[PDB]
Amino acid sequence: SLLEFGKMILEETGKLAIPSYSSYGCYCGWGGKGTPKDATDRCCFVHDCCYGNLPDCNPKSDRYKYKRVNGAIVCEKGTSCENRICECDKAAAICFRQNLNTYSKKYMLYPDFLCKGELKC
């Protein structure tokens, strides 16, 4: 759930997921449309697509477990859903870190009306 994912985000970026990545661009929040603003925003886009391909699950609420081994996130072994949700989160957390380089403050608190158009996964 948001609890584990947020821990990963902090671990990988040194930033608190909320409010750093909770109102960022067009896809780092609840919104779901328009062209991602930058690399960080695309990370959220991909994350939505991953969760979007877990129909048989409950991404935001299902609690899962994981641990770090040699500095790299390692998803433990839970139910099918737990491992898949954990992987989706891991990929995003790492994506955020890889692109901290281009994280822009100007995309924080981004107005949703500035995002229009469906971008298929």
């Binding site: 759930s1 947020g6 608190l16 997921a17």
Partner: peptide, 5 residues
């Protein structure tokens, strides 16, 4: 922890 809502 905080998450991207």
């Amino acid at each position: 922890l905080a998450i991207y809502s």
